[PDB]
Design a protein around this ligand. Sequence first.
Ligand SMILES: NC(=O)C1=CN([C@@H]2O[C@H](COP(=O)(O)OP(=O)(O)OC[C@H]3O[C@@H](n4cnc5c(N)ncnc54)[C@H](OP(=O)(O)O)[C@@H]3O)[C@@H](O)[C@H]2O)C=CC1
Ligand code: SF4
Ligand code: SF4
Ligand code: SF4
Ligand SMILES: [Zn+2]
Lengths: 154, 116, 56, 207, 96, 46, 339, 156, 48, 176
Amino acid sequence: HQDLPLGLMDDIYEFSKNFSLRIDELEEMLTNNRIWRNRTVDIGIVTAEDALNYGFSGVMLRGSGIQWDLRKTQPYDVYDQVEFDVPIGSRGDCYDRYLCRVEEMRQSIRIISQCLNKMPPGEIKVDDAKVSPPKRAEMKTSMESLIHHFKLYT
Amino acid sequence: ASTSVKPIFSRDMNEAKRRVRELYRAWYREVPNTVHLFQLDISVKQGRDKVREMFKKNAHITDPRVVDLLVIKGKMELEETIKVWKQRTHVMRFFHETEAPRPKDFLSKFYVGHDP
Amino acid sequence: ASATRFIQWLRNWASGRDLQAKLQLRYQEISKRTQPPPKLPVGPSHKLSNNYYCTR
Amino acid sequence: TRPTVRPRNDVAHKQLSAFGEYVAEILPKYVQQVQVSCFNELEICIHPDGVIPVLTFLRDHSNAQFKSLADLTAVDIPTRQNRFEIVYNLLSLRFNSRIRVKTYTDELTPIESSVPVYKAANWYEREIWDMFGVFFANHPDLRRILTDYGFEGHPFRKDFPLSGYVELRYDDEVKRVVAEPVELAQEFRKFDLNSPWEAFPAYRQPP
Amino acid sequence: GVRTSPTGEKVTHTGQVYDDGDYRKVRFVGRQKEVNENFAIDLIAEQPVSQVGSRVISCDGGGGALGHPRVYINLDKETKTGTCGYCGLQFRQQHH
Amino acid sequence: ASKVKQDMPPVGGYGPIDYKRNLPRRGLSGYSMFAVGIGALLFGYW
Amino acid sequence: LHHAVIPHGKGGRSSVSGIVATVFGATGFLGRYVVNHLGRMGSQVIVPHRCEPYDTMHLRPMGDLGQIIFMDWNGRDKDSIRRAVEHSSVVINLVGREWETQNFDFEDVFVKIPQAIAQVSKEAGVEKFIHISHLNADIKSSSKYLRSKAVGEKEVRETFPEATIIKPAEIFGREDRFLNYFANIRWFGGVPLISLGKKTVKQPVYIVDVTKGIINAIKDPDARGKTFAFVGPSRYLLFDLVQYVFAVAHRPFLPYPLPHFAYRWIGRLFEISPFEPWTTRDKVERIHTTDKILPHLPGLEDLGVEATPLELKAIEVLRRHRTYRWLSDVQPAKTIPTS
Amino acid sequence: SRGEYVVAKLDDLINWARRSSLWPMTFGLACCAVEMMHMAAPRYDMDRFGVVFRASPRQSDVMIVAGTLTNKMAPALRKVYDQMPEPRYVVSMGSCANGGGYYHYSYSVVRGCDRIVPVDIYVPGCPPTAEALLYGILQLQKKIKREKRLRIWYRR
Amino acid sequence: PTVKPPTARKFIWTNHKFNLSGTPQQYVPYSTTRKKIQEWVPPSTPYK
Amino acid sequence: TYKYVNLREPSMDMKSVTDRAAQTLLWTELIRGLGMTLSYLFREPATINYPFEKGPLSPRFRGEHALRRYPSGEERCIACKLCEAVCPAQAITIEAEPRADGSRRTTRYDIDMTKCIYCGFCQEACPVDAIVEGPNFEFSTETHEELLYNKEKLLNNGDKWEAEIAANIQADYLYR
Ligand SMILES: NC(=O)C1=CN([C@@H]2O[C@H](COP(=O)(O)OP(=O)(O)OC[C@H]3O[C@@H](n4cnc5c(N)ncnc54)[C@H](OP(=O)(O)O)[C@@H]3O)[C@@H](O)[C@H]2O)C=CC1
Ligand code: SF4
Ligand code: SF4
Ligand code: SF4
Ligand SMILES: [Zn+2]
């Protein structure tokens, strides 16, 4: 709908710079804890074939070892220009799917870093007034840009 | 032929009207302990009268496939009252204890509003 | 960031890491709340010629 | 390429068309129509009597291997004699492709349940029965899933009003939540937005 | 410019006022009737009329892209005054 | 008549961002901890 | 009447019925049902309350947005009465109290306040007026409660000549003080009764029957300036009636006699409390007063309502006095022949 | 000197106790439950106003309805309200719980929780920001501060 | 405001009010339009 | 590219097994967990002192509504009903008629703040910036009725918040 306000991509960098430590503090409490492991290890075991035949998707397939992530197999937008890894489980239980999600938080920081650097300039909505509305400056000075504004919102 | 149509459970009315009776037996032998678990304030008498009314309204049907659905839906409405998935309010929504009468005589409808 | 040195050492020792360089509270590294007005670009259809709609 | 036009994929268009004839040749008994949309989707239309033979083929055949039921839903078109339109969306991780299989039925005609082929279809078929009234034969458990208990109707059909027929409140006389005919403080306002000018000459029907 | 009715109920710029025996006046007992004091029709008729030296003058509400769609007004008629359809300001031609 | 000004990354890009797991390793060997525990007892018993 | 608010709709929650009602004393047991019916049919109900706004909260769900209106009033400020009735078309008075207080007694609540409401309403222009009295109302009864209603009932008809007066009997219901009262005597051991409950005949009436009757008087024009007497379908003997209560409650029943004078003694030490008295000397008399059989006053049937039997809706009230949830039929109480 | 003053001060104490120890029961049903959790997060920390994160229905005082109240769920909401010990207050949070919100015209949505339980405060928004809700809870305290439960007893 | 004061106008309030809910100054909604259908007032002069 | 999350096998040498035995018997790992919470016992809490402190916002924020005016005093709304036709929740009702001075102006404008989802489409479609979502977010009410705004309440909000609404648009009208 609008372009990013000036001074936003800097704040995202400040947040992304310190987030990775917060994940580490999360893992200290849970990953190697014996109490947390006993409530997630060998719990909810799902076989690879059952996951596919029950319609499971996401970490419910990867957690069981199936290598599949739509961002890399059927890419949309510009997910074909960012490098990241897809965490994969080996056991297929609650603990493994908890490690995929915690790992997916680290690969998101990895992707967010690249998006900040590789952001290109230009417009932010399709330059076609019959699908996306025109700017308010133009809607108030051109008769074509007012008709299309009138009919896109009514 | 277009008239030929796949059946649901029963291939003709004689076979279809058997299920209506078997379904009716289930309801008649379920009100007394329905009124007990749900702690309703209606006697088993008028509880059983209600089931009589519901069947009697679907008495003009003559299509075996329409009757099968009215039984299939009837069985579902029973599984909810035996497994107590329905709450006290759901079972008492048949008896309409909060809707004022809507008279059928012409003058009463004429006095109140424009509807027929 | 106002923690005395002894507390800084104790928090750092307990956690096993240097927490002072990655504070979760923001002090002055945030961008200013008022910014110079922008002037955004215009799309590739802002041409006065060779821009008939039927070709796009 | 133009900066505001989605580019074509002719390579995918040919491959899916080739696979469309492959299925049509292996199942002449059930396949009635086969399309490929301009954005490269493959739709297979089959007689309703071929839900299991055509799904079991795609789920097991080596050159198909569609081992995941993405979704299952029905579309209501009142004008057609068989109003309802059952739709299957399958996925193939082996070949990284998707196929959509469509069939149909009407109010009183059963459609064979596909739970034996896809266990994911268990709950989906309950949703179709609850919202559309289609009855699936041999379903292990067919019950309302979304609607309120004792709800009479099938909301997603095109002739069930948006506001329903009954509404709930709490009447203190009986100390329970009761149901009464629907009255609205502000009627939903119907807008006639369709323009009277043909928008797309490409999709013009014959007179 | 409120025109309080005889019973003591203020009249809004739209002209709404409950009659003497309308039961709907009970909603104000113990409370107040929200009325906007500044009337639009009394603040735009107290503006000076602008004198311009051309047959067509264009108004855009003042403030550029923060006003209203720019329109062009014809001042050829001596009897009356040109009037912006959006903002209500008036323009007149100097002498011809 | 200024140029186009919109939010963009600063020239030279942003500094590196860490994301990998960095759980530190600490403590004594398993043998040593037993030695202190066993030794703590014997002084206690004595 | 050139305004004549015009009914619209299907008689539901969002409809308009044209009845602008001021229900005095609507925060109590009898008020809950009258406000509920008026609002359930889309009516403009003004609810003057003396209590705190918290106690009126249960009334808010009983009407559409803007229908139930709450005002603050005092029984001794006629200006607060007029502010609540100048815009209305019907005034219903349900004000009452089972006990006296340092501030309000039986003379004030049953005579002075009802008299003030009628005088203010008449000048304000209200065309209707519904008053509630008691069936056993007379000026020669030991009870002070029943003496003050007979006086007040007469003053209403000399101040509002068109007023409608209703004379129900002891009304039973979920929040009542008649059936719940008897069930609560289980705390003190036995169940004392003057004499042994014989020679006492009562004719209780269901709350909804009273509530449905009051509304009808607001619609039909034949109820103006007329007196009624809402009574139940059957007459019971007080001992049999109380025995039935403990039967549904499924609790021990050990009635024992108590002299009339002795029953008044205990009623004096139970009314010393600065809170809701458990029992009062006045309460003992009314529990042992034989409901009149006035046959010349129209009843519920004359207003289209049908009386509800006690047996049908008795398990509803007493369900919570039982000490077990399910308890796996109680014989109907002996009924005096109508004759 | 007058008893009114003795009972006016004594009413302030009970008002103070009931306003400084609100124990809410969150009926988190939809998105509006996320903003409720944020209000309990470090930044706002409802717990420092005496408002505990969560409680059981019979240890609770205020019910926060945060989400869309469907017909299927309405019977359960009323039952919990009936079992809450008094005094009890309901805070209606979000457009869905006030008058229906986005789904006003749905066949399955109850067009406002005020049709099922009484409401003491309405917090608008979609969702109401975590700070907007904290304005509703504080505005609820000022309602309890104005209550005159003991005064009205003394003048019956 | 001390540095960049707001623009001043005649219609802007000079006395900001706070949340007035619960007090007598609260806002009570009403319809701002006029009556749509007008009734027929019979003549006040008796006939015959 | 993928990576294995839990594929490393544990060692089976004498030192390794004793480390796992010492961990089990001496509760070593759990004592490490107590350390992290101890650090948070000596960190400055992130709690702001509401209502004397406030959470940060931006000029784009969407709060309570308000009908604006021109610098003169005339209403900006010319009763075009574009906002009414884009409102996802149908929370706006508008009626209009010629004024005594022959101008296109409204005689009814109500926003049902209980139906409204605070989405911003009404101010994107208004061609004259008449309806805006102000920066206020503190308008909790005690009754349902007083959340059904009409033209008077909205016009008061314009006359009440014009100082801040006009500033916010000045800081944001170049992006939109
Ligand atoms: N219920 C029965 O069995 C019988 C009822 N009636 C008659 O019905 C009427 C009462 O019915 P009921 O609902 O059970 O009575 P309630 O005990 O439930 O309360 C009566 C109402 O009147 C109000 N009230 C009492 N005194 C005053 C006062 N000085 N000033 C203002 N308000 C006052 C009370 O307000 P608040 O409590 O908020 O202070 C209350 O809301 C009486 O006239 C009674 O004679 C007739 C026959 C039998
Ligand atoms: S009001 Fe908005 S945020 Fe809250 S439940 Fe409804 S849609 Fe979700
Ligand atoms: S914010 Fe969205 S839902 Fe609310 S009034 Fe504006 S357009 Fe309608
Ligand atoms: S507020 Fe704006 S969009 Fe809505 S009717 Fe008025 S001028 Fe048109
Ligand atoms: Zn203009």
